[PDB]
Design a protein around this nucleic acid. Structure first.
Lengths: 83, 154, 79, 129, 150
RNA sequence: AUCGAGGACUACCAAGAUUAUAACGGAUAACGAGGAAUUGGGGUUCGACAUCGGAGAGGGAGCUUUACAGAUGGCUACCAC
RNA sequence: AUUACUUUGAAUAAAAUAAGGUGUUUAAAGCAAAACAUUAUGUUAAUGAAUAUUCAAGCAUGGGACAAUGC
RNA sequence: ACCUUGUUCAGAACUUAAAGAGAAAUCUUGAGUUUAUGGACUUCAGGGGGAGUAUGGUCACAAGGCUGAAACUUAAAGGAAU
């Protein structure tokens, strides 16, 4: 670009827009989360971009469907980000 | 008993009878002659314990090891008591200021002391008197290397 | 406790000291740095080289704090 | 494929200065790349540089100040004897007072001036005006 | 770019800048090893074994927990397959294409891609022999691979 | 056998040796080198001929004397003079 | 641990090339002649250019950055 | 799903340039980073004809394909633009 920004201190917004690899220090866009079951109270921890059917550990209200890039959680499944 | 496979009787160059327990020359046996070659080369245990006979082995004969000393990789082990050693070196062409890869084959004599010597092994050779039309070197030590499903021993 | 072994160099002359790789200066200092920080975890590392009296000064700064090397531990500057 | 990382770095730096850019980024960092920059700093051709650690042979950011006309690497690093120095400078450098070669020697990576002082030759890396 | 066609994609994974296990992870190496051990006995590739742990057990990186890679773990337990996983899957595709080619003799694109696949096999087999993974007596043959791959 | 190593030659034994890093062949109006001409650097071309080494005495071949010769301003035989 | 690279050397026929001295009347040459001692005497037991080379190999030495075979 | 927008990855393209290059036409996802000449590797060319011809070798049922000169002749042949 003709106009140039600092290459050591990129903004929070600028790094978020960039590709997951083309950042200053590459970081994954994925995360680990747990899903409370609709059927029971147990929380099953799983990858954000899981590539298989996600079942509860108790039963199996299947909690997610793998769809080419991110888990398709059911509309009644609530999750939080595991930090 | 196993080394007497030729038409003549095989003897060492320096064959002498040992003394018996009573202190007199025992003509019923012959001492196994073994010498040590020079510049930092150890005599393999086979040249001491072994019963082979060779008149060109540097450890159990009167062949000397002279100044020239080289190294290489065993190429062929099909001929009896003889191997072919290949040396890979770089030749400098002055005009282009670049080296080019070259190779030369040296026919060297392999004594039966080195029994575990196969194709592809790294071998240190020394220069001796002409022992054949082309064989003018002798194997002094060898190190085994990786295998290629063709274990062609000497 | 960890030991940084001596190396052979090429012309050498001498012997080896059994270095595996866990006994390298890089690994030992990194192992000390991680173990020393423990609860804390290091997520950045930047080295700044500048001229000081005609000599280069590699100012290593362990960054994001969430042996013989002078380092400057600090948090994200703007995050 | 990336055969010479130093060639990639010096082409990035030269391209940045022709466009007047303030700072440039080099993705693969090496010891040799760092040594080449240190030689260029001692002659005050670049202000400074910083090295970020990405756990993957991290990146280098170099600050430029209107002074680096051209820094280029030299393909296969010829074995430069001490008597062949002035033959190389007469070919690669603009004059007898301006530029400096870079050589890798057993005493480190040094330019032609102090390698002559230390009385040692070696492979040639590159140059800069 | 790719080895055999002019395609150029950069679809990769991005390991985080944290070589240690995350704070929220509590399972020790004993559970990780045995869970991985049970999966190996079921006939699962090492690449798929790690994915199952990541998706189900939340162990996304095994080297961050146990300090050693999956293949090293499997070798210590002796459950590493004799034929390396990447080479095994390549010979599984060469067999499958060849079987289709027996009935469809006129398919000229399958003959081309079978040639590319077999060239890959001879590249991997040569490398693994220099790495001493495969004994020098190993050799890929069409009349033989149908049985071992099966 | 030779002054002597050695397939240099003989008897028996084995199947070996070289080759795309150019073997085996073909050409040279080719004796090799120190060197010579011209050259910013790199190079290109030449070297029968001062000096060092090799080979020859019209063509091969075989020998004598002697410490040294397969000698030819020594000998024998054949070919051309 | 070797090799390669690099720095110093060892050893290596002259002539030739470069180059040191020397008024062959200059010069190309030669390696002699003299400068002054008014020279037998004395410099003097006078000069011999250190004469340097020099590539591709070979031998030894200090360094291990860049490289190959490590194992 | 279809459609309108922000970001980003891959693909075939297009427009502008007082800039870079080139003999110019033009090129810009290069034909740029080259007398400030060196990122890695392979193939090909040496004025126009004779001529991809003759001969030799090899492949093919054949037409032909691959390799491939010399004698001689000639101050031009050719490229982009006004």
């Amino acid at each position: 670009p003709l106009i140039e920004v600092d290459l050591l201190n990129p903004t929070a917004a600028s790094e978020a827009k960039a590709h997951k690899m083309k950042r200053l220090v590459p970081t994954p866009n994925s995360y680990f989360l747990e899903i409370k079951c609709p059927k029971c109270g147990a929380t099953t921890t799983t990858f954000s971009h899981a590539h298989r059917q996600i079942l509860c550990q108790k039963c199996g209200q299947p909690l997610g469907q793998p769809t080419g890039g991110k888990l398709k959680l059911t509309q009644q499944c609530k999750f939080r980000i595991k930090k | 008993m196993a080394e007497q496979t030729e038409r003549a009787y095989q003897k060492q160059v320096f064959h002498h009878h040992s003394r018996n327990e009573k202190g007199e020359i025992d003509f019923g046996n012959v001492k196994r002659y073994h010498k040590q070659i020079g510049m930092g080369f150890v005599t393999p245990a086979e040249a001491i314990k072994g019963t082979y006979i060779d008149k060109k082995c540097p450890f159990t004969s009167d062949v000397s090891i002279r100044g020239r000393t080289l190294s290489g990789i065993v190429k062929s082990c099909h001929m009896k008591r003889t191997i072919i050693v290949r040396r890979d070196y770089f030749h400098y062409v002055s005009k282009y200021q670049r080296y080019e890869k070259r190779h030369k084959n040296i026919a060297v004599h392999c004594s039966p002391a080195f029994r575990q010597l196969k194709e592809g092994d790294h071998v240190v050779i020394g220069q001796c008197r002409p022992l054949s039309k082309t064989v003018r070197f002798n194997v002094l030590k060898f190190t085994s290397r990786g295998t290629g499903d063709k274990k062609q021993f000497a | 406790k960890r030991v940084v072994a001596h190396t052979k160099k090429v012309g050498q002359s001498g012997k080896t000291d059994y270095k595996p790789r866990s006994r390298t200066s890089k690994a030992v200092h990194e192992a000390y740095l991680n173990e020393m920080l423990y609860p804390v975890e290091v997520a950045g590392q930047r080295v700044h080289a500048t001229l000081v009296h005609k000599k280069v000064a590699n100012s290593k700064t362990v960054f994001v704090a969430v042996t013989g090397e002078k380092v400057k531990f600090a948090f994200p500057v703007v995050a | 494929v990336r055969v010479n990382v130093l060639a990639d770095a010096l082409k990035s730096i030269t391209n940045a200065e022709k466009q007047g850019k303030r700072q440039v980024m080099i993705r693969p960092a090496s010891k040799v790349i760092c040594e080449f920059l240190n030689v260029m700093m001692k002659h005050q051709y670049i202000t400074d540089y910083t090295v970020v650690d990405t756990h993957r042979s991290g990146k280098i950011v170099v600050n430029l100040n209107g002074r680096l006309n051209k820094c280029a690497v030299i393909s296969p690093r010829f074995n430069v004897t001490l008597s062949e120095f002035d033959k190389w400078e007469a070919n690669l450098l603009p004059s007898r007072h301006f530029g400096a070669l870079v050589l890798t020697t057993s005493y480190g990576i040094l330019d032609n001036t102090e390698a002559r002082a230390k009385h040692t030759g070696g492979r040639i890396l590159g140059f800069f005006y | 770019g790719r080895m055999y066609n002019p395609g150029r994609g950069i679809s990769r994974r991005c390991i985080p800048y944290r070589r240690s296990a995350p704070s929220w992870l509590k399972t020790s190496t004993l559970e990780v090893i045995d869970e991985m051990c049970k999966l190996a006995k079921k006939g699962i590739a090492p690449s798929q074994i790690g994915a199952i742990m990541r998706d189900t057990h939340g162990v996304g990186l095994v080297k961050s927990v146990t300090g050693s890679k999956v293949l090293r773990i499997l070798k210590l337990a002796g459950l590493a397959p004799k034929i390396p996983e990447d080479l095994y899957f390549l010979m599984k595709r060469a067999v499958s294409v060849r079987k289709h080619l027996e009935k469809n003799k006129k398919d000229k694109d399958a003959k081309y891609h079978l040639i590319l696949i077999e060239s890959k096999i001879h590249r991997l087999t040569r490398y693994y022999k220099s790495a001493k993974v495969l004994e020098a007596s190993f050799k890929y043959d069409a009349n033989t691979a149908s049985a071992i791959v099966s």
